[PDB]
Design a protein around this nucleic acid. Sequence first.
DNA 1: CGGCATACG
DNA 2: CGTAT
DNA 3: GCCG
Length: 325
Amino acid sequence: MPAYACQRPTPLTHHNTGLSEALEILAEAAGFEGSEGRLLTFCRAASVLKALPSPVTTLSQLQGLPHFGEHSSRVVQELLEHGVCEEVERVRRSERYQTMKLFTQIFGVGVKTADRWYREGLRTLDDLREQPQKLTQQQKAGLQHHQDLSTPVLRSDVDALQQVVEEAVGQALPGATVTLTGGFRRGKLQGHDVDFLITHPKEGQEAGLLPRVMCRLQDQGLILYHQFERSFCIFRLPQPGSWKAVRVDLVVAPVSQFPFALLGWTGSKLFQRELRRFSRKEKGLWLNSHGLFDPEQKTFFQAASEEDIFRHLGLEYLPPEQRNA
DNA sequence: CGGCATACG
DNA sequence: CGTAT
DNA sequence: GCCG
Ligand SMILES: [Cl-]
Ligand SMILES: [Mg+2]
Ligand SMILES: [Mn+2]
Ligand code: NA
């Protein structure tokens, strides 16, 4: 089992679901406390289990696996022996975990904002509503739409949204294309947001495109909220006899950069962190959603496909469906 | 022990 | 500070 | 929290 998640296939569904979910509770809790190192190790240990070909049934099967030390192994040991891990259950029950989770789920609220509200004594969404002078307009949107945004987006919803986005993109710039990215491109059947990547086959034609797209969507009455290359929107999506608010992210890239942006926006988030870490630490190349830089030659790698990029980095190619780290 | 991904709004 | 993967 |  290699040590980096980008070095191994990770399917969407797997054989250690319970064990990985427990570790990911501890990762999330570490994040709420500002401990990014411990978050990362628990995330990585969870991801290793997702990559295994069968269920872990005994503690000895952890021997030799990367990212499994005293703490993560103990978590698994307790789950194997008793069906529950006391530490994990304590986190789950805690007022701190539950409130930080509730608050950071709001669009516009991060760990630092959640933490300050927690420390001021706030606990509930209605606590926040009763003091709206304390909220940004982004947070106000996030709070008004919180119920709808908490309901999973389905793949049927995605196809309807894609047709709508293509229509506006087509008026804004004939020939521009719309590609589904994010978790749905990895094969997820549900999600909490839809991600699209927009480009045009003629380099440079995409300059200034996103404002033109947003103006057109707004004119069609589709935009409940938005604030450039990236747009984080709340869309009005048709429902039987009504509609619901859906988070949609729109990203534009020049076609020269499209493979990098496609790779970068298709995720998973842990997969991208591990791939960038691998690039820099193992190959000495600097990766982002724009390009891949050799800091010795001071040159950028030209890529025509995601396949090109995996080959550049000396990694076996992984389709999106195997990037669910 | 240092490091932990890398951007844009 | 927030957002994204 | 774990790797190297
Ligand atoms: Cl980036
Ligand atoms: Mg997404
Ligand atoms: Mn998104
Ligand atoms: Na949030």
